[PDB]
Amino acid sequence: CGGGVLSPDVVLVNGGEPPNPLIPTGTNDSNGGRIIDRLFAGLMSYDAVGKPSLEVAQSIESADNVNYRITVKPGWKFTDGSPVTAHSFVDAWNYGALSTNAQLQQHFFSPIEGFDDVAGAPGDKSRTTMSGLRVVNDLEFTVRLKAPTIDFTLRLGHSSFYPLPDSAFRDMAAFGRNPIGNGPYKLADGPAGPAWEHNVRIDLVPNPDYHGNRKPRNKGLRFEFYANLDTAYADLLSGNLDVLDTIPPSALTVYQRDLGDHATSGPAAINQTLDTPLRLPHFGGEEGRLRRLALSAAINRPQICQQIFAGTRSPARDFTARSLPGFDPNLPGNEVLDYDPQRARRLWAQADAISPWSGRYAIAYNADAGHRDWVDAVANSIKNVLGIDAVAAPQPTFAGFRTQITNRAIDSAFRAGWRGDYPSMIEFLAPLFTAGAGSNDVGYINPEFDAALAAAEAAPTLTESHELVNDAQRILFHDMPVVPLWDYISVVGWSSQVSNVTVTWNGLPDYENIVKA
Amino acid sequence: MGWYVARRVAVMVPVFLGATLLIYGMVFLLPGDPVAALAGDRPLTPAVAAQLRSHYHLDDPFLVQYLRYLGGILHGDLGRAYSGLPVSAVLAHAFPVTIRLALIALAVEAVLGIGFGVIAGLRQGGIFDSAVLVTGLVIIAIPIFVLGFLAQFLFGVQLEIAPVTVGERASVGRLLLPGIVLGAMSFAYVVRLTRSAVAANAHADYVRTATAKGLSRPRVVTVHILRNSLIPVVTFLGADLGALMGGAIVTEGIFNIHGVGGVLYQAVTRQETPTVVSIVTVLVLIYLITNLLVDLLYAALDPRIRYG
Amino acid sequence: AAPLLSVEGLEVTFGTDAPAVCGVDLAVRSGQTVAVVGESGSGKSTTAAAILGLLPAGGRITAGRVVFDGRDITGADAKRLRSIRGREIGYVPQDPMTNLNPVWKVGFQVTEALRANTDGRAARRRAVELLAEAGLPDPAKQAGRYPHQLSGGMCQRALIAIGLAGRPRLLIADEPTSALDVTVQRQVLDHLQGLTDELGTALLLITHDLALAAQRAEAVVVVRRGVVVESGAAQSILQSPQHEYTRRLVAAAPSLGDILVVSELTKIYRESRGAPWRRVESRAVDGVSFRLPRASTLAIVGESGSGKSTLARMVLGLLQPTSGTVVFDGTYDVGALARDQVLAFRRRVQPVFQNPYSSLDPMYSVFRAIEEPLRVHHVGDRRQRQRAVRELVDQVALPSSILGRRPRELSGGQRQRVAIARALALRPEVLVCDEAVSALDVLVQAQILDLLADLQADLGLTYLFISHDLAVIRQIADDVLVMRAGRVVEHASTEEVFSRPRHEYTRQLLQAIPGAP
């Protein structure tokens, strides 16, 4: 009598192969950025809900929301016995924000009042240090932004503002093979193996030199580099995994059935939308805006979320996501998006007074990760409901599809998802709908909208800015730059022994407090 | 008997040695460099191509490393699994459930097969006889994994009265259906064999001269027919336990039972050889031991071969 | 009045073919011995199983009646027959080897035949009492042996003890001492006819030869193909038979220079009995030496377990001796025969084997079985072989149409005729009859014996007739050689063995034939 599938004693969450050296400012993917949030610890941290709280810093003072003064706690140290100090932060930021190094996350350092000098052009790059970041002594410094940004103190917990040791600025090319940081966990590095197998696994054990907000409550993690999630699901079912972190699409209609309350779910901070790059004919001006409002009126979102996804999405009530702190679901005025064939047909009949129709209507999309189902469904439900002829037109290559739109908005109206980085709504609005702020692939220009966002940022408190953002979002409904489809919902399944998993705010579990017994 | 065991055991040593040497030859005697094949799927680096050379001793002649392999297997050193744990620990922790499954399979096999075979042999030419013979002939044809998929589908997906995934909740009530699926193949053979045996034995001469001295019908039946008939059934049961060892694999793979068959199905599907050769060696030794015990029982039951 | 067992009218039929036992009639007088006589297939043993109800799978009564004390026992109905079987009607089988359960400790098979007892105390000792009154040499030691460790003549005594267990009123001994050899059959029957005078049992016995049933029994009933041919007293039938079939059965019953010079032929056996370092030798033949003239007949006689078949095989080249020589004709030393002399000697000595049902290659027609020696020795082109075979099949009776049949559809005597005609193909100077006529019915036995005598007279042959008894040998043989345990006992002419024997083992082998004294 008895039995068992006897398992190691750490945790085996599935992961993936991070395609870059393990550097804070050098990664941009949630597949290799989930392994770097366990090694370091910044000036702040976010609990599962998404609220900031001081970890390393001790006092962040700003009486005008333009000048910040940061004083840091004394008693910290890296896993090589090197003292943490303000030099680490200042040097890490000055390194990452430099255009010479060609560093991925450089754009995040745009609001420091010294970024335009070091990332604009090599004509005034004789200085390679920003003029905002001062240093008073080794335990405090001073930042100076451009315009009042009440959202700055929230992004200091982002995975890009992390401190780096002293033995890294000189041999950085090696810091991609054995990183070192003051975080909760740390790379195992036992004689048994290299602690990073290169497409096999990564081990992590708790750092016994940590005193912070994210105390590890297990014995260590082991990220198992997988692919073809169905394999990881089989691995989980046959007692060889502990946290799946995503149920594969081929198994989310029976997962509850053969898991049995060993699977939960919760909203994420990723949305999805479709758009017509306004350079394509018959979509500029009033007629194009009316066509887009019609298309918003002509997609039944609950039906799709129930038929295709089977409940791993959520109908889009606005242009932000659900898990975002300070979300207004029943926003007065949220009616514009709907499934109201009455309004759709009458608006099409009102809008064709400038032109009946031009020709085809294609929807172009990457076709490797899987979009055929919902793309065909939206194409069909958008066709033969308003008297049009839309169809799909896939592009098999990721680089090809990305270059097709970085071709600066040619044709073949396409889909766009914008995963958030740190939990604030302005991070969803501004990087998308602004005069020239990069990803504005719909040609939407509004100085009224830009001024509304500016006034929302220049707020005394956070709830006031929440309300101002709500109103600046209401202003968006009158034009509908993109048409929003649905927010994400993530599913997490654990096996039989781990006991305290939760889905935090971006879909990923709370790895720090999954107690295994 | 005493001079039969000392001969049934002497005929066992070369079998043991030859089987182990054959298994250890088919590997290490073939593809030039064997460390290439022992790598599974993970990439090979000079830090992995040296952890197993120290555990296999691939630098010296074949005799010494074969001897060391046998000694290591016997001292309780079966290798190191994928997750870093010694394979011996995993086997010692996963044998209870596979025994709990094999017991149900063998119970249905023995009881049902013997009962129906006796009832069909003690009345030949009947409709029941023809029905059971044709049904056994049909049941034999279906492979194990096909029958497992059919049972899984029909009884778990259409009308949920059985668990589709027996994951670490392996009470007998939840292990009943996989056991039946595992044991139907053998139940068919057993019922056919015992039917033929009883039908051909109920006409011997000692049966007639035993019923010719006033013995009752139940007593004649039980003693004189159900001893001489049931001996070959136990011989076949030994052989077919041997053949069922490897049928348990697929029926624990498609039902997600955390047994030794589940361990072996993982290691086989995910291409992990070093933890396959060891488990198979252990299974072969268990098979040989069970065969020897069945031979001793056979000798104890039939006094003619027990002539010394 | 109204004797036991009036069987008038039995009409057994074996599964819709034809009555295998037509109308018979017999009646046992409750104190007298009645013997039924007839060849095989005459339906005697069948009507010894139709009374007890032990008919095989097919048979069933279809007419007549069987009374016993006045109560019809034709009512199979194994609830009334259960009170007659064993308790008032015994039974003694025919085959000694295969009539005891081979896994059940004969002392335990005897103890349940008397089931009316204490079930554990009177059983295990009264059974040994019965085994003692049967005649076993020491019962208490052989009541603990399986039925494969007892001699041939001890299983029959055990079966007699099982038979007369419940003190029946009628024993139905069915051809009991037919597999046993003489000087054992006689002792067993002398004891069985003494176990009856103490009890009063009736003893209806089945046999197949008059000369026996005329000195044992009191009434004789002859059967031909399931028809009662004749019935009456014993003496009156033997001295004056009326129906011609009985006359033919009487007149065919047993009542009335040197080429091959063996010298000191010995054959030892390095036997194995268990413990490998313990191997005993069993001297099977030793000290045999004789001389056989031309155109004569020598006849070797010995019981089962005397080593005469070994002698035959060592004489006709198929066995290597251990000593002595078997020189033939003056040059053909059979001990070490040269290469050419193999086929120089295979056509001058030819054997005729024991039973015909297993010596004819089931897949050969009776032409391709006769022409085989004619093919191996390269004689006759293609059609001179058909001429030779057609002339060979003529010297035995064997109608000239028998060619092209198969051994599976031939008679019992036709198979032995075919084997003789094969052995006589290529002009053999000597035949070796190895118990040739011993498994045949009495009439065909006399027929082929006369055939052999005729062939000898007309071809100048020379016979080495081997036989297990001495009554079928007075007519044909000219010299006799008695053997015991390998040794030679006596060697003289027929008269000097049939008139005045000179060894206490030949005398008590003569008087053991069914002769008057």
Partner: protein, 284 residues
């Protein structure tokens, strides 16, 4: 009155089991030989759009995940499975029969060697041994599958053939044949192969279905035939994830695989009942 090989050709002809088995085996052999007759489609062209269609006039057995219509892919798999099984059975018949006959008829120092080797090989079950030996093979084609199966399938046929020839050798015609010449090999052929080649035929035509089943369940686990040859048990490997959701695509290849094995078992059984009824008491 007709050659024991023509008289049974008339005792078997009137058996319904034999008739059904013969018809089925004929059809299976024809569909294995000439697939291009029963269809016109291609068994590897993958239309991506029509991905989980239903039975229709164009596609009789629907379409599977990537667009392959299951009807086409359910034929060339028959080709592969049948050729594997048949080749392995032929090889095992020849080799096992030869060794067992040589061991039974001759005896000293040959029966010893053959029986020791047979007892060594009988210790490794077929499936486990093939699984172990198919791990170190990189070149995995049909011929290596035939080799792996034939290497471990012979012990049973050798045992049966040796038993039959040994039982024959204890008869008197193989003694009257040496009583006139006929050196121990000519007698072997002429008198002991005919009278003992029956039971060997029965056990071989059962081992055929056994080998088909083993090859299928070996290709299902992944260590069998490669993925470049279309085959049952490998069309079942991929269609097991859409089974737990309630789609019976898996049963089109499995339904056809579990039918040829029947066509072979119920033929071996008729052959067994016709040429060797006797030993149905103690073997089986």
């Amino acid at each position: 009155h007709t050659g024991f090989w023509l008289d049974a050709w008339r005792g078997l002809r009137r058996r319904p089991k034999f008739v059904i088995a013969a018809a089925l085996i004929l059809l299976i052999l024809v569909v294995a030989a000439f697939p291009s007759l029963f269809t016109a489609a291609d068994p590897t062209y993958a239309d991506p759009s029509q991905s989980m269609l239903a039975p229709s006039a164009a596609h009789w057995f629907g379409t599977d995940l990537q667009g392959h219509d299951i009807y086409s892919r359910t034929v060339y798999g028959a080709r592969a499975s049948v050729t594997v099984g048949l080749g392995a059975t032929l090889a095992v018949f020849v080799v096992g029969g030869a060794l067992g006959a040589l061991a039974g008829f001759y005896g000293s120092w040959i029966d010893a060697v053959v029986s020791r080797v047979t007892d060594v090989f009988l210790g490794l079950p077929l499936l486990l041994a093939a699984i172990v030996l198919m791990q170190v093979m990189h070149h995995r084609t049909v011929w290596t599958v035939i080799a792996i199966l034939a290497l471990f399938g012979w012990p049973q046929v050798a045992r049966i053939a040796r038993g039959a020839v040994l039982e024959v050798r204890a008869s008197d015609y193989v003694l009257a044949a040496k009583a006139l010449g006929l050196n121990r090999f000519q007698i072997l052929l002429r008198h002991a192969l005919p009278n003992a080649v029956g039971p060997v035929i029965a056990v071989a035509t059962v081992a055929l279905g056994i080998f088909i089943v083993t090859e299928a369940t070996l290709s299902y686990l992944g260590v069998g035939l490669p993925t470049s040859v279309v085959s049952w048990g490998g069309d079942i490997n991929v269609a097991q994830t859409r089974l737990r959701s309630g789609s019976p695509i898996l049963f089109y290849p499995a339904g056809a695989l579990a039918i040829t094995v029947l066509a072979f078992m119920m033929m071996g059984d008729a052959l067994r009942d016709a040429l060797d009824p006797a030993s149905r008491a103690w073997r089986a």
